[PDB]
């Protein structure tokens, strides 16, 4: 996508909130400890307890988000992604084709008809005696 979005289309830094799905959960998992079981009372708080790099998952997320920036080969995206990347480009190109091979031919026919019959082929011939081509978009009359 063209526009940059911190959450989804973050191409400036390449940050990703979660690790790749390819990695086993034992190797790397999304940072989610909402399901942690209640802490036993005899356990004592050693660390700060503050959300941050003391948590293993968050640490691995930061580490991977920096070490993923160098890779031996490309991670080929599927054709669906590639189509979306240039959706506007392809659509504009087809619009140009339509303007040349659809709009072009009937516009030429209308002008040639206008030459002989004074008004385009999609207009009501007048009887008022006024001269000239008149309107072109008949449905906006």
């Amino acid at each position: 996508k063209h526009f940059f979005t911190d959450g989804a289309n973050d191409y400036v830094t390449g940050w990703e909130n979660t690790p790749p799905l390819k990695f086993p959960a034992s190797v790397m998992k999304p940072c989610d400890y909402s399901m942690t079981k209640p802490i036993p009372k005899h356990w004592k708080l050693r660390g700060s307890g503050i959300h941050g790099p003391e948590n293993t998952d968050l640490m691995k997320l930061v580490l991977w988000n920096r070490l993923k920036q160098k890779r031996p080969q490309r991670e080929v995206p599927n054709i669906n992604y590639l189509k979306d990347s240039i959706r506007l480009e392809l659509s504009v190109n087809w619009w140009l084709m339509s303007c040349i091979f659809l709009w072009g031919p009937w516009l030429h026919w209308g002008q040639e008809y206008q030459k002989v019959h004074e008004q385009p082929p999609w207009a009501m011939k007048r009887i008022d005696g006024l001269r000239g081509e008149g309107y072109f978009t008949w449905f906006l009359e």
Binding site: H2, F4, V12, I86, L88, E89, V92, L96, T137
Partner: protein, 230 residues
């Protein structure tokens, strides 16, 4: 540990640019105004250099900040055109029955729409290459040819038009809307003349800005064509 932001403490371009603006008002010669415009260009370019040199701070939020500024600016460009469309339609009740010759709906609209579409395709190819870390030299010169033809066609139209600005508010609105589009076309030339391949690639705000602006101008011409020619 470093500070989150590398504060800029002093700047002197602002004084110069503001004085340059005053010269436009406090002058007795139109030649002074021409040379003053060059001074403006120079100092606006210095400000752009300051933006490029701010890259040394390695601040992630800089791209986002500039991108959103462009969004606001584009919005202001769209709303200025809206004001002209408003001026045009307010007097719609006095159009089409006056003894003036309005524009044809066959020649100008088609060649212009076909031309501006090709301009979009070139910019789109530039974006595609930008994505692929590639460059094609001929692309920019195709833009120059397109701009040349656009300028050649608009000049002849105005010179061969048989109705003047003082003939009717219809004619005034037609000329003004077309001129406003042309000015935005010329601003596109101002931006595109510096297009080159930079190796920092997608952290360069220039590329996204050009793509957005060119699309805006072409889309704006679709609205104009429907209102005036068709």
């Amino acid at each position: 540990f470093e500070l989150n932001i590398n504060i800029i403490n002093y700047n002197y371009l602002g004084i110069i640019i503001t004085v340059i603006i005053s010269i436009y008002i406090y002058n007795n010669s139109n030649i002074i105004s021409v040379y003053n415009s060059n001074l403006l260009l120079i100092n606006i370019n210095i400000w752009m250099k300051y933006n490029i040199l701010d890259m040394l701070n390695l601040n992630v939020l800089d791209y986002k900040i500039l991108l959103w500024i462009v969004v606001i600016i584009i919005s202001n460009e769209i709303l200025l055109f809206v004001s002209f469309y408003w001026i045009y339609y307010h007097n719609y009740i006095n159009y089409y029955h006056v003894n003036i010759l309005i524009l044809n709906s066959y020649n100008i609209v088609y060649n212009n729409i076909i031309l501006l579409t090709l301009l979009s395709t070139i910019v789109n190819i530039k974006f595609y290459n930008y994505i692929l870390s590639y460059y094609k030299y001929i692309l920019s010169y195709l833009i120059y040819y397109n701009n040349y033809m656009f300028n050649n066609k608009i000049i002849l139209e105005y010179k061969n038009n048989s109705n003047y600005t003082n003939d009717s508010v219809y004619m005034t609105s037609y000329f003004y809307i077309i001129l406003l589009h042309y000015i935005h076309i010329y601003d596109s030339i101002i931006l595109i003349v510096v297009y080159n391949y930079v190796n920092y690639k997608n952290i360069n705000n220039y590329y996204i800005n050009i793509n957005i602006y060119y699309h805006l101008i072409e889309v704006l011409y679709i609205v104009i064509s429907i209102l005036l020619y068709l």
